[PDB]
Structure 1
């Protein structure tokens, strides 16, 4: 009995709120655990996501001085690496994000502005998300070029640490790659692959996602550069990923899909992509191995998924 998936973009409304209601910020472990103001702020961002419906403007939020400071620290620290460590695509778009989107140490960009910018670049759009969605639900969004995106910021006591996605990771890690057409097509391919796929393949796709969108390296002429959002938003790991320490292997999906990984330390191993067009082709070949009694394609004119046989 084939798993349901949205067939229109508005149908992402359906399971968008089906998050893990009891989130990371509730653990005694969390940098913000003892902070009741932080607790409430987090629920505030969650209620914004909860009430969001596809098509609406994303609500603007006045960030606090404390939050802007945390952003500032993440921004300045990370900025110092991008020219040398980040891929061309990243460095190419970053100044535009500064000019048109207010990417600056003193200013946390608003999601609506960033979403409009991306729509202009590649048709990618943002949708605020409360918390952790299933891989199935999150990856499905990508098929429509929709990135489920957090709006809250990490707790101010630890600006270099987040166990979770937060706004810094989304804007400084993901957003600049979603501005590139080739990357955008690649990421969407992973989304298309996920539609109606068995649970076992959702997990293989999530693993591929992690070794690409989150922790991917790519060839850049004779050199290698970072493009994964998890690398680009981690000061420590961004420098480490391109030192002699980690092991590097070519992106190869039948191996990548089964490779184990942990979230708590630096990756002992990275996969290197030839280019985003090549990763896309590889994902397209891999999707053909997924037992699905149909074929899918996205029609951007009507914003619907076409389902054949």
Structure 2
């Protein structure tokens, strides 16, 4: 059985198991030829490298150029949320603006955002430099821990990123973690992953793609976006609620094996009835994963109980 963390501090092992040779090193990265941007990325990676559970997340002073990039992404996306984002998103966004400094001329600091999520649902952030394995990323969710980038995309192409950057995490992921039902749903995926065989990890990663990253949900008689990758994509957020894509009900035996690509708009989305119903479905799917034990998180001690 694969090793998995049993205490929240044990997530500290992940930082020495990331992909070391990251996207910003590629010839086609928007910032590839910018040595200043290169050094900035390395500085953020070093903060995540040295971070340890329990510490406050170091604050960073963002440059004017970084704030400009943030403000372009923020103001162009914000125009779609009232109409395209789910209720839970719009409900919390004004509080993020009031208490977390979410505004076009200011990049929120992860420590503030983390304390805010803690008050809402117990979720917390940890800074992460580069790409975690699916197993390690998902396992953090068991503890209501979200590994979060601190860096920003290159300012030459503000509307484009080949990777999660701080605009994706804060405008795409964070608002849903403020919701109890969504937090329980995403934690359920994390719990399903612990000690699961690699073959089932890939399936959970695919369910994750079609829910947390690109999911749509029913809302009264309508349909709204909740996936992080939709909420942080101006073009795909408008497309996903148009007549063009195909929609199917969330059905995890099907969703789990569905292929997808990361470089175009999704041709197909799965619709969740609700976050509670998705959570039930994940729980049922997880019972089908060959594991010689069952797992439960204890938030009082921040430990996983293994039976």
| TM-score, normalised via structure 2 length | 1.00
User: Whole-Å Cα distance in 2 between the matches of residues 106 and 190 of structure 1?
Assistant: 35
**How far is 1:100 from its partner?**
0.2
1:15 Cα offset (Å) = 1.9
Deviation at 1:16, TM superposition (A): 2.5
Check the 8 A contact 1:204/1:257 in 2, yes or no: yes
Q: Cα distance, 1:202 vs. partner?
A: 0.3
2:271, 2:15 → 1: CA distance? 32
Displacement of 1:105 in angstroms is: 0.2
For 1:56 and 1:17, how far apart are their aligned partners in 2? 17
Give the deviation of 1:9 after TM superposition.
Answer: 0.2
What secondary structure, in the 3-state scheme, does the structure 2 residue paired with 1:16 have? helix
Q: How far is the alpha carbon of 1:14 from its aligned partner?
A: 1.1
CA deviation digits over 1:164-207, x for unaligned, max 9?
Answer: 00000000000000000000000000000000000000000000
Deviation at 1:304, TM superposition (A): 0.1
- Partners in 2 of 1:16 and 1:23 — Cα distance? 14
Contact 1:78 1:234 in 2 (8 A): yes
Distance (whole Å) between structure 2 residues aligned to residue 64 and residue 299 of structure 1:
41
SS of the aligned residue for 1:15 comes to: helix
Deviations 1:19-43 (A, max 9, x none): 1000011000100000000000000
For the 8 Å contact 1:211–1:271, the answer to whether it is kept is yes
CA distance in 2, matches of 1:203, 1:161: 27
Q: State the distance in 1 between where 2:30 and 2:109 align.
A: 24
Deviates more, 1:59-68 or 1:12-21: 12-21
Q: Deviations over 1:137-181 (max 9, x none)?
A: 000000000000000000000011001000000000000000000
Structure 2 partner of 1:144: 143
Asked whether the 8 Å contact 1:17–1:130 carries over to 2, the reply is no
5 Å-filtered alignment, 1:209-224, equals 209-224=208-223
Q: Gapped runs of 5+ residues in structure 2? A: none
Q: Give how far 1:17 is off.
A: 3.1
1:289 partner SS = coil
The question of whether the paired residues in 2 share the 8 Å contact of 1:19 and 1:131 is answered with: yes
CA separation in 1, counterparts of 2:28 and 2:67? 23
Aligned length: 307
What is the TM-score of this pair, normalised by structure 1? Answer: 0.99
Partners in 1 of 2:98 and 2:79 — Cα distance? 18
Counterparts of 1:106 and 1:240, CA distance in 2: 28
Partner Cα distance (1:277, 1:95) in 2:
24
When the two chains are superposed, the root-mean-square deviation of aligned CA atoms in Å is 0.4
CA–CA separation in structure 2 for the residues paired with 1:200 and 1:174: 26
Q: Secondary structure at the match of 1:270?
A: strand
Shift of 1:18: 1.3
Moved more, 12-21 or 39-48: 12-21
SS of match in other structure, 1:91: helix
Residues 243-269 of structure 1: CA distance to partner in whole angstroms, max 9, x if unpaired? 000000000000000000000000000
Secondary structure of 1:264's counterpart equals coil
- Are 1:38 and 2:37 counterparts? yes
**Does the CA-based 8 Å contact 1:16-1:137 persist in structure 2?**
no
How far off its partner does 1:276 sit? Answer: 0.1
